[PDB]
A paper describes a structure:
Ara1 was subsquently re-annotated as an α,β-dicarbonyl reductase which belongs to the aldo–keto reductase (AKR) family. That is, Ara1 catalyzes the reduction of α,β-dicarbonyl compounds such as methylglyoxal, diacetyl and pentanedione, which are known to be toxic metabolic by-products. Microarray data showed that environmental stresses, including heat shock and oxidative stress, markedly stimulate up-regulation of ara1 transcription in yeast cells. It is suggested that the primary role of Ara1 is to reduce a variety of toxic aldehydes and ketones produced during stress. Here, we determined the first crystal structures of Ara1: in the apo form at 2.10 Å resolution and complexed with the coenzyme NADPH at 2.00 Å resolution.
The asymmetric unit contains a dimer of Ara1 with an interface area of 1030 Å2. Gel-filtration chromatography also indicated the existence of Ara1 as a dimer in solution. The dimeric interface is mainly mediated by strands βA, βB and two loops (Met15–Tyr24 and Lys91–Leu96) in each subunit and contains eight hydrogen bonds and 111 non-bonded contacts, which include hydrophobic interactions and salt bridges. As in other AKR structures, the TIM barrel is mainly composed of eight parallel β-strands, and each β-strand alternates with an α-helix running antiparallel to the strand. The two antiparallel β-strands (βA and βB) at the N-terminus cover the bottom of the barrel. In the apo form, the cofactor-binding pocket and the active site are relatively open and relaxed. Superposition of apo-form Ara1 on the the Ara1–NADPH complex yields an r.m.s.d. of 0.25 Å over 297 Cα atoms. Analysis of the Ara1 structure shows that the three loop regions (A, B and C) exhibit relatively high B factors, and this structural flexibility and plasticity was supposed to be necessary for the recognition of more than one substrate.
Author numbering:
A (entry chain B), B (entry chain A): 15 to 344
């Protein structure tokens, strides 16, 4: 009965646009793609006004289907919602195409936020059995990732810029990036005019990303936290400090890991397909400065990056070797 | 450094419309009417997206002038703002006129919320020197308030409904009431079709209004707290428990008195003309269930209603005799 609910908190982007601090993640497994629809419906019914998706997820049509029904029955209006999608590295140089395909899949006229998914460029390998006739993450027979020979990752954002700045184009309300390092953002700020509204990265008490947080705050860029539970197994719920503070604030570990970000001014997009936990996990734990420092200390002592797939290896921040299991044995 | 700011919290009215939990009050003293303009401008630039005013205040023109300048220089868009105004008992049976007069004074095409200011009806006494050619709060030669003899207070709300329900009238987005008791709300619910989105009343640690809170929650009516500091001399700032919790949560007394309401899901509209205080007092104290009960218990043991003018005496809830100063001895 106490407020705010995390669904009731809105942050301001650097272009003056408000974004709900809590959003639903939709990077669901291939066997569960169609379950996205009921999750989005459940989320919005419980008060979510933010849905995060992507061209690469193959969940856009199910996001679109859920929205269509809530529009039709008068549960929601388009302008009430904040919809994010992303351009995958395979279309690094075909942003316009990526956006139109995303909008068609979503059955929408515009998205609120469009991101560069990775600072990466992939080769375009034909495959009828892929996404839009292309291999999502191409490898050779070795099998190592096939990066585009002529690829410049900033070309994606430059094309994002051009759509955002075109006074005759109303397909986006904001642009941003995902998985960018300080170093890459510096190049972007140096070479580009539009300041990304967000940098969507993995962050949570096992990966506080302190230096990135400080940098982004200094440059008017909001972080969006993905995999806040630690992806598969939700290992972050097992952190003793997380359990302790959840008990103290009379909330679930889920609420605590959400609140960890919102408290620090960070947008958070937990992924779930469970309608019950989606509807229930909306409580706020307003953690003290000392509690945040305790949580952040833990992360620096036991760093774990759960999302670190082979394709990300060329990035100085990513190893490509997945998580370090040695730091989970605390 | 920490979030949410109180400017970042949005509640949902029963018609789906979102209202910012924090609003600027504009019932400013007659000597200081013009100072409202800089206060509104300061508020909006600081992050406020909710301005509360009334036909009766004579501050509408200054609210409108502040808004116009912010619209014109691109600081804000109309749809970003939530604007509330109110119908005074002198126009209890002329809601259309009141609304049009407010809209003219504000320089706006619509208000987000239109309230019945009091469950009262005043006689119309001509005075070219008064507001809209009328005495605001008429007293007879004997000095007593001149109520409309044929007056039914609920007629005001019924006129509000008509404007609200009219598919071809876009002057309002929501309606509600102010200074209503449980009993008056019960008659409203029995006789009318539209559930008031809010009931705006004086409430704070000295006047917790526990029973009204429970009723309104059950019937999906949001409370809006006015005079949260306790009017003249801001006496609530001096409550030992308020200073105590303020220090605990690293916030000012002002912030704590705002947070008291927002934590309980109550909209709050502190009135201020101090631009530096308006800008800085946006911090949130996420009070526990125990600390709120401490504050609410204080109000039950030390009840003080600060807003209680002679004109409200005929209402069972009001005495007309102002604050009980004997409950200020602490």
């Amino acid at each position: 009965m106490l407020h705010p609910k995390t669904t009731e908190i809105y942050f301001s982007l650097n272009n003056g646009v408000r974004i709900p601090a809590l959003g639903l993640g939709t990077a669901n497994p291939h066997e569960k793609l169609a379950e996205t629809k009921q999750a989005v419906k459940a989320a919005i019914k419980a008060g979510y006004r933010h849905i995060d998706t992507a061209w690469a997820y193959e969940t856009e049509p199910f996001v679109g289907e859920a929205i269509k029904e809530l529009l039709e029955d008068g549960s929601i209006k388009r302008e009430d919602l904040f919809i994010t999608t992303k351009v995958w590295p395979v279309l690094w140089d075909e942003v316009d195409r990526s956006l139109n395909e995303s909008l068609k899949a979503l059955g929408l006229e515009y998205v609120d936020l469009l991101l560069q998914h990775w600072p990466l460029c992939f080769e375009k390998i034909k495959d009828p059995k892929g996404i839009s006739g292309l291999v999502k993450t191409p490898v050779d027979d070795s099998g190592k990732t096939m990066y585009a020979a002529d690829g410049d990752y900033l070309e994606t954002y430059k094309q994002l810029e051009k759509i955002y700045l075109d006074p005759n184009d109303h397909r986006v309300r904001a642009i941003g990036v995902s998985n960018f390092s300080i170093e890459y953002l510096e190049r972007l700020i140096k070479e580009c005019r539009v300041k990304p509204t967000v940098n969507q990265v993995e962050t949570h008490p096992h990966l506080p990303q302190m230096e990135l947080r400080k940098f982004c705050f200094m440059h008017d860029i909001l972080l969006t936290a993905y995999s806040p539970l630690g992806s598969h197994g939700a290992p972050n719920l097992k952190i003793p400090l997380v359990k302790k503070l959840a008990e103290k604030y009379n909330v679930t570990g889920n609420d605590l890991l959400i609140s960890y970000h919102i408290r620090q001014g960070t947008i958070v997009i937990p992924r779930s397909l469970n309608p019950v936990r989606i509807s229930s996990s909306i409580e706020f734990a307003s953690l003290t400065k000392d509690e945040l420092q305790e949580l952040n200390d833990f992360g620096e002592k036991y760093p774990v990056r759960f999302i670190d797939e082979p394709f990300a290896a060329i990035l100085p921040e990513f190893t490509g070797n997945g998580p370090n299991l040695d730091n989970l044995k605390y």
